[PDB]
Amino acid sequence: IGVPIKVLHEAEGHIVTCETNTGEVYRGKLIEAEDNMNCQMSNITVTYRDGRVAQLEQVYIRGSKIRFLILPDMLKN
Amino acid sequence: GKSSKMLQHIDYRMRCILQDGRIFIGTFKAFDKHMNLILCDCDEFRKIKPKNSKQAEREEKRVLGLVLLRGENLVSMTVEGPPPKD
Amino acid sequence: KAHPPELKKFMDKKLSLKLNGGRHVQGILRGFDPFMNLVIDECVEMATSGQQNNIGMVVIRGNSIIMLEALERV
Amino acid sequence: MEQTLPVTVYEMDFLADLMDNSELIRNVTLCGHLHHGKTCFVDCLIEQTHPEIRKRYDQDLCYTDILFTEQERGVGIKSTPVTVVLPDTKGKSYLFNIMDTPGHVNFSDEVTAGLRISDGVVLFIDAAEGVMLNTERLIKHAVQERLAVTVCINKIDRLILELKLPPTDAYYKLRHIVDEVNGLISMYSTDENLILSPLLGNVCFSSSQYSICFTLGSFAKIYADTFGDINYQEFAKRLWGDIYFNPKTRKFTKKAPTSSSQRSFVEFILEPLYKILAQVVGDVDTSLPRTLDELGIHLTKEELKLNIRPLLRLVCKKFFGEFTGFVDMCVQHIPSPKVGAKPKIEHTYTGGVDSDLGEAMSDCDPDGPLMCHTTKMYSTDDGVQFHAFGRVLSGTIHAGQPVKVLGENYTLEDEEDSQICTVGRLWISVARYHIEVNRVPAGNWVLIEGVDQPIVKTATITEPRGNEEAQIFRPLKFNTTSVIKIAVEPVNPSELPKMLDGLRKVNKSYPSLTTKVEESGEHVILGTGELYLDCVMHDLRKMYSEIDIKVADPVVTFCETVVETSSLKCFAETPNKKNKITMIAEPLEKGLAEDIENEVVQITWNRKKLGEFFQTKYDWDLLAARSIWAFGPDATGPNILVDDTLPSEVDKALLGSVKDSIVQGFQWGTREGPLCDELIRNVKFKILDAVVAQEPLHRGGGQIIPTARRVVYSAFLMATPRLMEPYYFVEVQAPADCVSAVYTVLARRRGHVTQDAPIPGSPLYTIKAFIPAIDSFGFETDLRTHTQGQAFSLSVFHHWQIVPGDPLDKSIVIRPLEPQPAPHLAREFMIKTRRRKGLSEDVSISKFFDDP
Amino acid sequence: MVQPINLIFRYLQNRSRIQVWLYEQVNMRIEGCIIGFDEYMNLVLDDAEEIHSKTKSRKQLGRIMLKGDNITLLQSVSN
RNA sequence: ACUCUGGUUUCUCUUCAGAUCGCAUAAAUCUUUCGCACUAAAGAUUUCCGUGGAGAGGAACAACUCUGAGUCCAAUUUUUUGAGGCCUUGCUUUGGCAAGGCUA
């Protein structure tokens, strides 16, 4: 078990953002954080590289196209 | 055998350059076998790394908090300094 | 080990999928596999010009899978 | 903030960070029957999350149950809140607010206080005793409070080290327990969505003594860790429910191969547990190292020298590890404050979800209007100041912040029961230590300081200069009724004020306690039993008021009723000699009062549905089903007020002007009652006639309320009056031989044994009985002493049953100090109570009439 | 629950003309009747033809072996 | 998978010890209490019966069990590549950088 997968699984229940390789940044509640980097959120705000933002009732990005993820640092301390 | 090369830079503020060209400077508090890093107090800058910049040292700097750099897009890493007491 | 993707809640629901090369499809998930191979029943690929072409049920690989967006209530 | 705190696995900053995210918070109440392991389970969790805290080899350390009386008795008395950060199966840490409630039935009110500020219930059931009385009562109360329910089958080791059941028989016992719980839930809940089964993860098997906590998912993950190739979720799906395993095909099938293979649960879960326990307890010195190596557990030489019980605890801690099964069970099935806010507002908030503020609270957003709701009052060690404990439903409470605290009588029309107070400090409430924090976001439990002054039982904390339409939360509806009545006085009257202060304090410490002063200046405390009142008086003597206090012998609060209609239509006029009201009283139908009490009918319903119900269920006339005015003294009171005045004789519009006054008089009269100033129960009052003065100033106010009470009293008295004793339900867990002896005890206390069924899978029997509460004093002690302590009983209020005697019988002679025979017990119960209240020697049937 | 491997096996057994899209190259795809598949996603297409949507040209190659890494999505076609 | 401490047994001394120092239980003295004090309670002190902890010293035979410390993965989802080439705009640190449209 990796420290990053454990931090992604422990980051569920709070608000966090995830930017993919194509620049699409989806921010919302981490509903499902799988061990393969699959991030499923509900009611996530997705902003693409062009600058347009949209809202999704349920989004699910695979771990193969994951670039970075920003979660809260209050749980690490 | 020892594996202390990853633990020597653990808990210190390092600035890593990813494959996309961005520079993330943060406290490397987490690692893994896949090269996935965890940066506490991580700041991402895409313009240039500020090293004695006369005109400006921070251009396009965005603070994230607990950033999770994926090991698939990792290119190289550089050490910046030791971590704080808090 | 070798767990499949989270497709139980999105199975049998009309949602959109993003494939590599800027591809966009919309259909009902009839099932998934362990290698990310999912079945899209009634798939309609939306082209870049705006028109959508219905291709029916197809098999989408997990390598070029960008992201899925549920168009219904889970 | 920054303060000294004990060493813990996580960090306080992480705990504070988890509080902000309402999706990772679980408000859990660990309820169950007496001594079923809830406190030991909480202690196991604390040991897991606190490296420096370790359970003694001989004494089962209890992190909760911090009171001195709790330590001496060994019985949990007050709910203890504990906020921890627990890792899940996947490793994701969740914030857990656990309200360890007492298991004793007398303190069931305490559990209610822990059910208002919780979203999920974990019911602990002994694997040996099974489902007991308090488990059934708590299931009914939880599913009636709209709470998610999960089950922890504690003390599975008793199936292995006490009963020595075969593994298949242990599986049968567990399955029977689960089936019985499911049947109880289905009986108390119309919806069948919440089926409980370990396949769904709703059920966890635990042994808090030896720290053996596991669910199907967790133990399947143990298999996944020891053998990587297996996926734990599907395996956990296949582990339970009479699904056999074929090792020739390595496949799980409902058809049993070889006709001798055990189930998946027995083969994969139960049998390895039996082997571990038997190797530790039987073959330690000769064959423990081999099995320890096979399990990957390595123990030091000093660790292997421990006694058998500590060695079992250590081995099972090393094997099962953290209590991740409990975390799964409470994460997948218990809603978070975000998810579970809507049912809580719909059930408890008076304004309802449809209100704007109800919609605001449905989101449980930290950045909203403050709507904290505290249901507990925790006294400090010195006992001077009280901290109000409760969850924050919206907004965020800050230390040193002005606050409007609303009492139980606060309404929009009358806001007098509200006080502006300054919050002193805020603590996150762990059991033996408190983490001082600057703020607490919505969806978390908090010990507000400085708001204890304007509240006795229940509070509604909100912010001032805002929420002008904010209403209070409904006061705690209690599982049982407080009956046992004791008079309390000081030894030295010069120190009377101290006791008075103490009374106030106990009124704050015990949610269901009722302290008042009767007409004779006698201070009265109402409790649910003898242990409850013992704890109350210990607190009153040692914690709050350090004075010597005399306590009268315990008596019960009787009820008043009628058995047949009034002989003549009673009537009363106002002191103005106008506004004549003519009424009669008749008994209600069987079960109608039970329907009213159990919220089956509500006066808040519209006229159409209420009339339809009263016309179809009890076959009332349409006019009689639509003329009902009010339900008894309080909301949903056992009595009923109806007006049979035909519109031809009485103007309905004019009567409606005095309808509020007449209803107030009815409620007051039913609350007081004319026999011995006791609640009037199961009586139907019909308004036969009503003259009303046309001018407003000659009616209403102090004219019609006392007149209505007088006419209610006359109608009740002319109808044949009777007294209701409170009858307790008693469950005795006794050995097979002692059952007969139990009857003997209940022979001497007017006890009727209803059933004496055995406990399946256990060598004991559960003797159920219906004993009068007035005769129940010392019955527990009598039963335990007569049977050499082998028989234990728990008594809880069940119903009201008419006393055999006739209260209005002046011919009966009663010696001052003699146990009266049954045929006139009511005559003894009416006059003596009349002397305790301070009223006259006896009441006459024409006392409240107008002719004499 | 219709999996993708079972649907691919049914499409290979039916002998219908299916079109496969290239992974990271949407301007040109392949089309043909796959006779069988492999465990690594490699299929044997009979009468394979590369169709480029940009130029509207079709180049046939015959019996071809398509790797599982280059094909991203596969759909059914009437022709 | 290779090195190095911490060994056990017994004797004696010193010191701490409110720990059930003790899963047992005595004696004395004083005060107090009502009887009128083996046949009696309370409070306190002290002495005996003998322990635990730590340290020191002695001598007996064991020296690395333990406690530790020092020391098999190229075919999706991360580490055995969709990888490289073309054009325009702002600055040119005239190397090229930043963005977009492509071909692959």
Is residue D369 a contact partner of residue D467, using CB atoms and an 8 Å limit? yes
Nearest-angstrom CA–CA distance, A52 and B44: 21
Is residue D27 a contact partner of residue D19, using CB atoms and an 8 Å limit? no
Nearest-angstrom CA–CA distance, D790 and D755: 19
Gap from B71 CA to F78 C1', Å: 6
What is the chain E residue with the closest CA to C17?
E73
Instruction: Report which residue type is found at A77.
Output: N
Nearest-angstrom CA–CA distance, D389 and D429: 9
Nearest-angstrom CA–CA distance, B16 and B19: 10
DSSP one-letter code for D268: I
- Among D672, D675, D658, D678, residue whose Cα is nearest residue D709: D672
Chains C and D touch (3+ CB pairs under 8 A): yes
Under an 8 Å CB criterion, which residues of B touch A? 20, 24, 29-34, 36-38, 40-41, 44, 64-70, 72-73
Instruction: Report which residue type is found at B43.
Output: D
Half-sphere exposure of D719 toward its Cβ, with a 13 Å CA cutoff?
A: 30
- Among D342, C15, D21, residue whose Cα is nearest residue A57: C15
Q: D453 vs C65, D200, D517, CA distance in Å?
A: 61, 46, 21
Map residue D532 onto helix, strand or coil. helix
DSSP one-letter code for D542: I
Q: What is the dihedral of CA D341, D343, D348, D354, to 10 degrees?
A: 90
What is the chain A residue with the closest CA to D92?
A10
Q: How far is B49 from chain A (nearest CA, A)?
A: 19
**What tokens were used for D307?**
């006694």
Could you tell me the end-to-end alpha-carbon distance of chain B, in angstroms, rounded to an integer? 31
In this complex, do E5 and C22 lie within 8 Å of one another by their Cβ atoms? no
Full DSSP string of D116-160: HT-SEEEEEEETTTBS-HHHHHHHHHHHHTT-EEEEEEE-TTHHH
CB contact set of D593 (below 8 Å; sequence gap of 6+) = D638, D639, D681, D682
Residue D550 CB coordination number (10 Å) = 9
Gap from D302 CA to F53 C1', Å: 19
Chains that touch A (3 or more CB pairs under 8 A): B, C, D
**What's the domain range around A38?**
1-77
In this complex, do A3 and B34 lie within 8 Å of one another by their Cβ atoms? no
Residues of A in contact with D89 (CB under 8 A): none
- CB of D701 within 8 Å of a chain C CB? The answer is no
Residue D225 CB coordination number (10 Å) = 13
Q: Mind listing the domains of chain E with CATH numbers? A: 3-77 (2.30.30.100)
Residues of E in contact with C43 (CB under 8 A): 75
Determination method here? Answer: cryo-EM
Nearest-angstrom CA–CA distance, D752 and D740: 13
Nearest-angstrom CA–CA distance, D196 and D121: 13
**CATH (domain of A46):** 2.30.30.100
Map residue D345 onto helix, strand or coil. helix
Strands A15-20 and A25-33: antiparallel
Q: Where are the alpha helices (DSSP H) in D243-374?
A: 264, 271-282, 284-294, 301-304, 308-320, 324-332, 337-348, 356-362
What is the chain A residue with the closest CA to C69?
A59
Domains in chain A, number? 1
Is residue C29 a contact partner of residue C5, using CB atoms and an 8 Å limit? no
Phi and psi at B29, nearest 5°, equal -105, -5
- Among D363, D379, D511, D438, residue whose Cα is nearest residue D16: D438
Please return the burial class of D334, using the count of CB atoms within 10 Å of its CB with bins 0-12, 13-18 and 19+: buried
- CB of C6 within 8 Å of a chain A CB? The answer is yes
Nearest-angstrom CA–CA distance, C36 and C29: 12
Full DSSP string of D625-649: HH-EEEESSSTT-S-EEEE---TTT
Residues of A in contact with B70 (CB under 8 A): 37, 66-69
Element (H, E) at D665: helix D659-672
The resolution in Å comes to 9.6
Is residue D755 a contact partner of residue D765, using CB atoms and an 8 Å limit? no
Nearest-angstrom CA–CA distance, D58 and D51: 19
| Per-window interface: D 87-116 vs A, CB < 8 A | 87-88, 90-94
Is residue D148 a contact partner of residue D335, using CB atoms and an 8 Å limit? yes
DSSP one-letter code for A67: E
**What tokens were used for A63?**
């771990």
Q: Which residue has the tokens 């002191």?
A: D575
Q: How far is D333 from chain A (nearest CA, A)?
A: 14
- Among D682, D466, D464, residue whose Cα is nearest residue D594: D682
Q: E56 vs C55, D463, E51, E52, CA distance in Å?
A: 19, 70, 7, 6
Instruction: Report which residue type is found at D120.
Output: G
Among D18, D25, D91, the residue with its CB nearest the CB of A6 is: D91
In this complex, do E4 and C39 lie within 8 Å of one another by their Cβ atoms? yes
Nearest-angstrom CA–CA distance, D118 and D548: 39
What is the chain C residue with the closest CA to E78?
C55
- CB of A36 within 8 Å of a chain B CB? The answer is no
Q: Which residue has the tokens 């006066």?
A: D603
Residues of C in contact with E22 (CB under 8 A): 21
Nearest-angstrom CA–CA distance, A62 and D498: 69
Q: Which nucleotide's C1' is closest to E67 (Cα)?
A: F75
Instruction: Report which residue type is found at E79.
Output: N
Is residue C44 a contact partner of residue C52, using CB atoms and an 8 Å limit? yes
> How many CB pairs below 8 A link C and D?
8
Map residue D74 onto helix, strand or coil. coil
Strands D484-490 and D549-551: antiparallel
Could you tell me the end-to-end alpha-carbon distance of chain D, in angstroms, rounded to an integer? 74
CB contact set of D754 (below 8 Å; sequence gap of 6+) = D768, D769, D770
Gap from D206 CA to F68 C1', Å: 34
Chains E and D touch (3+ CB pairs under 8 A): no
